[PDB]
Each structure stands twice: as C-alpha cells, then as structure tokens.
Amino acid sequence: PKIHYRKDYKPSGFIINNVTLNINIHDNETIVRSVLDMDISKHNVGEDLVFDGVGLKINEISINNKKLVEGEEYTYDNEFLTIFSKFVPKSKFAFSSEVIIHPETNYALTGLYKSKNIIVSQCEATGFRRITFFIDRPDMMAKYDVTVTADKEKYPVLLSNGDKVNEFEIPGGRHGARFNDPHLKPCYLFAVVAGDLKHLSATYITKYTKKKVELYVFSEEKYVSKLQWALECLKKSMAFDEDYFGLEYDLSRLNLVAVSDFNVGAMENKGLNIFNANSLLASKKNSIDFSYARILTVVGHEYFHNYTGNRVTLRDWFQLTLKEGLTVHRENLFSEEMTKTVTTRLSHVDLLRSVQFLEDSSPLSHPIRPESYVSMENFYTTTVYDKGSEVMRMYLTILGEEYYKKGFDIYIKKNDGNTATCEDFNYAMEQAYKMKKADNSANLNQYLLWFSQSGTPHVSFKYNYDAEKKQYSIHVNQYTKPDENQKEKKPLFIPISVGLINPENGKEMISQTTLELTKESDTFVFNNIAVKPIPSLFRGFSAPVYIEDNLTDEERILLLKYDSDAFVRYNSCTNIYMKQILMNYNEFLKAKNEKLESFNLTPVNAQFIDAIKYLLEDPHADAGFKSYIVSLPQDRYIINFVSNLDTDVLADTKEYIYKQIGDKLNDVYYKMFKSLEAKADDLTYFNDESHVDFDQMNMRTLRNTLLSLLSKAQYPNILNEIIEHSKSPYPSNWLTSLSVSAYFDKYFELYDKTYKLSKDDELLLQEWLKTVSRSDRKDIYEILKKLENEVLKDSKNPNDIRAVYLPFTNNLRRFHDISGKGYKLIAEVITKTDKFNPMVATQLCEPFKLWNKLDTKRQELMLNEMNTMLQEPNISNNLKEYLLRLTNKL
Ligand SMILES: Cc1ccccc1NC(=O)N[C@H](CC(C)C)C(=O)NO
Ligand SMILES: [Mg+2]
Ligand SMILES: [Mg+2]
Ligand SMILES: [Mg+2]
Ligand SMILES: [Zn+2]
C-alpha cells in the first residue's frame, strides 16, 4: 500500500491563486468547468504538474488555451492527471479542465452527491478531487469564484461559499447563481448545495465592530419546523466566541444546511456549514432530549472552526488535531457554559475513558499527531479529536484563563490567513507560559510529547501524614506502556489539579492548586495541614490518564459525599465499582474455569450503598449527578482493566452488582421516580424551540435511568408505571417505555405503539430503530431480521444502517454470543456497506477494535471474520488499511 510520512512534508512546486468554477447540474450528469490561475513557486525544480482527480470523465484539458492531448501532453489513470513538464509553463498560467461527474450515483457521500432531492458536496479530506482536478492538499490555498446552474423547479436554492454576487435565468427552465468567497482557503472547505430548501433567518450584530450578519438555516420543506433550535445555537456560538475569545464572524452571511445522507456529524465549509440532519434538526414533540445537546455541540463545533481551521488552517493532514482537538476543546468550553450542568464535563470524560482509552490500548493506537498514513480518513479518530481536546484543555489548566486567552490570541493572529502546525500552537502557549512564570527561560518543549507519544499514562499515588509536623506529602509516579510507536516512553508534563478534604468535617483544607509533574516521579509536600486529609486528585479530570488513587473504599465514599469536585466524586464512585467488578469477575471466572459446584461472591460494600441512598434522598443534590452514580461503568471502560475478558462472565458480574444494590435501594428508586415526575415532565418551554432547561432534562434522565433499574428488577407493578410513561408527551419518555418494556410481555404492544408515533418523521424513526436495536431482548436476533425486512430494507442512508446495528453491538450478552453469530452478522453488514460507502463501513468495524482484549475463543471468532472481510474482492482502501492495522499486519 502507498504510505505518507509526516517527516517527508515539502511545499509544492506550484501555486494555485484563483479558482473559477462553473458547476452545471443536469438529471443524469453534472458538468464541472474549472479555470485554475496558477504559478510556479520558489520550490519548483521543473517537475511534471500532477493533479489529483478521482473518477472524473475528461471533456477537455488546456493550458493558456492550448488543448492538451492524452498520451502526448498528459496522462490520466482515473486518480492522477500528469501534465508533462515540457508543457508546464515557467510563469503564471491558466489551467482549464472540463469534466463530467454523477452525483446521482455517488453513494459514498464524498465529493458531489445527491441526498434525497438535494445535491451537496463533502470535500474534507480528499473529496474535492472527486469534483475537479486539484493539488488536493490543505496548504494549497486559493480564492474561489463559483457559478452553479440547475433546473429552476427542482433546484430553486443554489448556494456556494461566500457572497452571492449575481443570479440569472437561463433558457430551458434553468437558472444560475454566482458566489465570491474573498477569504483564501484550502479546497477541503469548498461547498455547493442545490435544492428545494426552506429556511429560517435572523440578523446578528457583531459585538465589537457592529457588523450585520445574515444567519440562514436550511432544510427540506417537510422539516422546516425543526430549524429553530439550530438558529438559536448559532447565535449562542457566535456570542460565545466574541465573549471568551474576542472573535467575530467575517462574512456578511452564514448558511447552515441539513441533509439526510451524511457520513459523520457536520462540516465547516466557509460560510456554508453542512450537517447531518440528526445534528441540526429537532422539535420537542419529535426529538429526544439528547438531540438538543447534540445540535448545540455540533453547531458550536462547526462555528468555532471558522477560526480554528478556516482562518487558521492546516499545513498538512498530520496536523489534523490542531484544528479538531482545538475545536472540540472550544466546543466543550461552550457546551459547559451553555448547559451549566456538571454532567456535561462528566460526559466528555466518560467518552474519553471508554472509547478513546480502548483505542489507545489497541493495535490502532496512535499519537494525536500521527507519523504516517494510507487513508487519511482513518485518522479522524477519538484519539485525534477527544485526546486532542484534552491536550488542548491542559494548556488552559496550566496557564489559567487570563494567560490562556493571551496565548490563544498570539496563535490566532500570528497565523491568520495561513497554514499552521502543532508547533506553532505550542510556541504561542509557551510565550504565555513565559509571561505567567515571569521567566523568559521557562519552556514547553516537554509538552510536545503529548503530540508525539501514543498511549495513556498511568498515574499512581502514595500518601504520608506527619501529625506532629502538620505536614502532608503526595508522592506521584507516571508510567506509559511501551507500544508499536515507541519502545521507550518518556515522562510527560502532567498537570494535577488537587484539593485536600478534611474527613472529620468534609471541608476543604487548601486553596485548590495545580501540581506540575514533569518527571517520572515526584513528591509534593504541604505544610499547615491540621489533620490527615483525603486527597481530591485530578479535579475536573485534569489530564488524560489512568488514575490509581490508592484510596480505601471508606475514603472514596467520603469524597463521594463531601468533596466539591464533580469529577472526583464521580471517579471515587467509579473506582469503588471497578474494585467490585474486578473482584466479582475473578470469582465468577474461577468458578466457571474450575467447574465449581459452589463458591462465594464478595458483596457490594454496604456503606457505599448507604452513600448512594444518602445522595439520592438529598433533595438539593443534582439529578444528573445522581444518574451517573446508580449506573455502573460502561463496558468499554471496564475492558481497559481486564485481559482475556470473558464477556459472559462480565455480564453475570454486572447483573449481580446491580441486583445487590437494587435489593437495598429499589424502594428508594421507586419513591424518587414518582417524586421527580412533576418537575421532570413540567411543560414549561414545550413550545419554545429557543430555550432548553438542561437541569430538567437531567431530571428526565434520572427518571428514565431509575425506571430501567426497576424494570430489570421486576419491581412490583412497575408495568403500570411503564404504560403510563408511554403516554408522556416527551419522546425521551415514550421511547424509554419501549426499552424498559423489554422485560415484560407488553414489549411488542409498545413496539407497535411507538413505531406508529415515530414512522412519519425520518429522524424520530431512526431514534426508534436505535431503541429497538438496544433493547434487552432474548430474541434480539429475530427482531433485527424484522427491522431489516420491514424498515431498513435496501436503505443506503448511513443514519438508518447505524441505527439498526450499532446499538445492538453494545449488547454484551447477545453480540458476543459464543457461536460467533453476532460477529458474523456485523461483518456481513460491513462488507455489504463497503461496496458503496467505505467510510461508513469502517465506522461499522467499531466493535472489533477490542478483539485482542477478549477471551481466546472470542478473539479467534472475531479474527476469523476480520480476515474474511480482508479477503473480499475490491475491498476499499479505507477498510483494508483499517483491518490490516487492527489485525497487526500493518
Ligand atoms: C469524523 C469524526 C471523528 C471523530 C469525532 C467526531 C467526528 N465527527 C464529525 O462530524 N467530524 C467532522 C469531520 C468532517 C471531515 C466531515 C468535523 O470535525 N466537522 O468539523
Ligand atoms: Mg465518475
Ligand atoms: Mg462533540
Ligand atoms: Mg430515508
Ligand atoms: Zn471538526
């Protein structure tokens, strides 16, 4: 396979200054005429001029109006257009091509494609080359003049990046519109849309310069009623970037557009952000609660890219984390501000420590700045995004807000209108660090190891208290396991936010402080510590690491009850659960492997259970927080701690723990489920798509979590509650009713009731699919076949395929059926999907990432299906690279 290496970056021998496009859409073809105003750079050595261009049908090629001919002046192999150097001019020249493409048959959803009745593009990362010829790499920055033409009745709204400078009629019922985007950009930010779209709009006035900006949000007509919250979220995002970062929008208009068929969440094309409809559209009668947070985060994310990605872009794709890590960090700061709920930060931590930690202990492990790739599209990973965001957040922790803002402004201004690298960011942050330390010899050179070193550090602690001296020490060690990327791992710069809690009264003993660990080990000593404390470590999850607190369960309970920091309280609970899970898992495993007739199980700590009850009964404690403490850690977190994991033993472990706790708490759970109803399900704001009460949402989450627990338990007469819950106006509630009814004979009645409620809204039907797929049913395989035959059928919509299959792959007992039948079903889907959408097929591989963590029979089953997939003729490069890497062949 063809391998790109970070070290081999070199600037191009060519420059593309202007791009003038005419995109003429017809029913059975799209013609793209393109003039590139080009020149030779200072790096040119008289090389052949080689353009990327994939799957293009050439009508004509010329340079300075001289037609070039195949075999004589150029070659084209359906991937690269090579213009022989004799025919490449030595100063400014005009390159002209006209090609034919077919959006109507583009089911890969990259390049120019049709999504229902909308024509849309997706160019990041390598899609622009499927539209026209280009030197398709992000350092080739140019200005764009785009004309779109189409049939007027079918495609009345025509959009491209930037200012609409003309609109015109064309004979034969056609029309055109011309766009000028004044801002230099890489081709990955080009976009066009053509459709019968409806809109909402508003005018936004910028905070500092008072620029009037016209904000438009677009969808198909059926769903125009679902646009308002996105528009509100865009206004919020703009105000946030003004308020925190001092950054104003830079065009007279910003359009956001929803499309039904989209490979991921959304895309930041300049002035023309394009979204999966599931990440832009909601209404309170037709969407679950989680849609609202999802739209907030995705609108925010694309908006924040306007500076971190667009106004400052990437030198090369190895720098991906510089825009994605940084933008996710911005998106998270925004989300935390807008929701004002502690569960927001906790959700980010949960995502990292489950999926990203698994990735980082897998054969796919990479640093946030990879050293090589075959398909760049396989490095849009939770590592690059979520670990990257934690790396970007650690700068804020280290510097504090004021000096963080100073550093960020150095970066964004210095590199405006240009490309940048991860080093440029580190350099800006290092200038701020020098200022903060008031020491021009302070440096962040060690910090760069967070970009280059793969794997998750493990940080462990030992404590000592000297009562006579009132002096406390925290001894800290860090270790990162060697891997395929580095045989020797170096210590990182790890910021450890800490507090100290007095166990006798629950109060804070020090001003919070941030320990700067830079060696493999260090001892931090505190004076004037009046009694032996319990330490509150890694507050806010201050570095992306495995934490070994070396606390007793009694100490963890005291932090859970009394500490101030939500992450520490949550992590203390997580740790109590993990100790229990690992102990019961080992008990069950030994019993199974030794074929014992009788054995013991370690009970769940009774004082921990008492602590859960105390928290749940505190009417002044946070409902979202409560929902985190009654839930065991996710399976993808637990697996990071077990080698040769037997999934059936784990399922039995989790069931035992849950049942131990419910046997004590179910009456508490029931009382709370009823008491919370009035506030949870109050209809304030039910008609207001500009305002969400995230606290009330967390109350519904808690009710729905409790209802699940009580349903699994078969708590007496709970079916009555489930049936009432199905009548609630909130989709979060009535879909919960279907999930929790899995444990009762009423499940198929609720399956039909909820289907009827869901079937007339595309996105609600997809949420219904997910609810069915995740249902804890012994007959889940027969239900999946029913979904395939009755609902999914031949759909090529990635949201339908993902909705049917992904939730089911998280069913620990059933997906990992020891027959292998789960692995086989998903591998058949992956292979089917790969023949038309390789990016989605690779997404569907997710469950296999943990293969080498399983017991050896399951490892063998998964490996056999991965190798079967690899044998498939015409396997995509995306899938083949992914699977070769995952199975330790690449
Ligand atoms: C792909 C992915 C990987 C990891 C985490 C989140 C995403 N989702 C996107 O929507 N990503 C888009 C990618 C774009 C190339 C379509 C993104 O970052 N939008 O700004
Ligand atoms: Mg083609
Ligand atoms: Mg996000
Ligand atoms: Mg559809
Ligand atoms: Zn992004």
Q: Which of 133, 165, 197 is the last residue of a domain?
A: 197
Q: Give yes or no: residues 440 and 325 share one domain.
A: yes
Tokens of 493: 């710069």
Residue to probe by mutation, ligand 1, list 115, 264, 319, 327, most atoms within 8 Å of CB:
264
Q: Give yes or no: residues 329 and 439 share one domain.
A: yes
Query: What is the residue whose two structure tokens read 């077919």?
Result: 102
Measured in angstroms, how far is the CA atom of residue 324 from the centroid of ligand 3?
A: 10
Distances (CA, A) of 687 to 18, 285, 760: 48, 9, 20
Q: Is 98 one of the annotated active-site residues of the chain?
A: no
Q: Confirm whether 238 is domain-assigned.
A: yes
Q: Which amino acid is at 764?
A: L
- Write out the E strands in 755-878: none
The upper half-sphere exposure of residue 774, i.e. CA atoms within 13 Å in the direction of its Cβ, equals 18
Give the span between the Cα atoms of 158 and 140, in whole angstroms.
26
Q: Which ligand is nearest to the CA of 264?
A: 1
Give the span between the Cα atoms of 143 and 689, in whole angstroms.
37
Q: Which of 258, 283, 308 is the last residue of a domain?
A: 283
Residues, the chain, total? 890
Q: The domain spanning residue 178 has which CATH number?
A: 2.60.40.1730
Residue whose Cα lies nearest atom 20 of ligand 1: it is: 267
Point out the ligand 1 atom lying closest to the alpha carbon of residue 267: 19
Cβ distance 870 to 880 under 8 Å?
Answer: yes
Q: Give yes or no: residues 687 and 766 share one domain.
A: yes
Helix, strand, coil shares of the chain as percentages rounded to 5?
45, 20, 35
DSSP 476-495: EEEE----SS-SSPPPP-EE
Q: The domain spanning residue 251 has which CATH number?
A: 3.30.2010.30
Q: Give yes or no: residues 214 and 164 share one domain.
A: no
Q: Give yes or no: residues 691 and 792 share one domain.
A: yes
Residue 232's region, left for phi above 0, alpha for psi from -120 to 50, else beta, is alpha
Measured in angstroms, how far is the CA atom of residue 328 from the centroid of ligand 3?
A: 6
Q: Give yes or no: residues 679 and 533 share one domain.
A: no
The upper half-sphere exposure of residue 887, i.e. CA atoms within 13 Å in the direction of its Cβ, equals 20
Q: Confirm whether 73 is domain-assigned.
A: yes
Q: The domain spanning residue 774 has which CATH number?
A: 1.25.50.10
Q: Which of 197, 225, 251 is the last residue of a domain?
A: 197
Q: Confirm whether 321 is domain-assigned.
A: yes
Point out the ligand 1 atom lying closest to the alpha carbon of residue 305: 20
Q: Confirm whether 372 is domain-assigned.
A: yes
Q: Give yes or no: residues 174 and 193 share one domain.
A: yes
Query: What is the residue whose two structure tokens read 């493999």?
Result: 520
Query: What is the residue whose two structure tokens read 């670990």?
Result: 387
Point out the ligand 1 atom lying closest to the alpha carbon of residue 188: 15
Q: Give yes or no: residues 241 and 190 share one domain.
A: no
Q: Which ligand is nearest to the CA of 29?
A: 2
Q: Confirm whether 2 is domain-assigned.
A: no
> In what order do the strands lie in the sheet containing 74-76?
49-52, 80-83, 74-76
Q: Give yes or no: residues 306 and 436 share one domain.
A: yes
Residue to probe by mutation, ligand 1, list 257, 324, 882, most atoms within 8 Å of CB:
324
Beta bridge partners of residue 204, listed in sequence order: 213
Measured in angstroms, how far is the CA atom of residue 19 from the centroid of ligand 4?
A: 35
Final resolution, Å? 1.7
Measured in angstroms, how far is the CA atom of residue 383 from the centroid of ligand 3?
A: 13
Q: Confirm whether 4 is domain-assigned.
A: no
Give the span between the Cα atoms of 577 and 3, in whole angstroms.
44
Q: Which letter, b or e, does each residue of 302-321 get, where b requires 16 or more Cβ atoms within 10 Å of its Cβ?
A: bbbbbbbbbbbbbbbbbbbb
Q: The domain spanning residue 391 has which CATH number?
A: 1.10.390.10
Q: The domain spanning residue 473 has which CATH number?
A: 2.60.40.1840
Give the span between the Cα atoms of 744 and 711, in whole angstroms.
8
Cβ distance 577 to 612 under 8 Å?
Answer: no
- Write out the E strands in 77-185: 80-83, 93-101, 111-115, 118-122, 142-151, 157-160, 163-170, 174-185
**What is the number of domains present in the chain?**
5
Q: Give yes or no: residues 341 and 425 share one domain.
A: yes
Q: Give yes or no: residues 688 and 793 share one domain.
A: yes
From the candidates 73, 220, 302, 881, give the one annotated as an active-site residue.
302
Distances (CA, A) of 390 to 435, 494, 520: 23, 11, 20
Q: Give yes or no: residues 563 and 701 share one domain.
A: yes
Give the span between the Cα atoms of 741 and 718, in whole angstroms.
10
Q: Confirm whether 329 is domain-assigned.
A: yes
Binding residues for Zn(2+): 301, 305, 324
Residue whose Cα lies nearest atom 16 of ligand 1: it is: 267
Residue to probe by mutation, ligand 1, list 270, 380, 840, most atoms within 8 Å of CB:
380
- Write out the E strands in 510-628: 513-517, 521-526, 534-537, 546-548
Note down the domain range covering 749: 551-890
* Torsion sign, CA atoms 310, 315, 320, 326: negative
Q: Confirm whether 1 is domain-assigned.
A: no
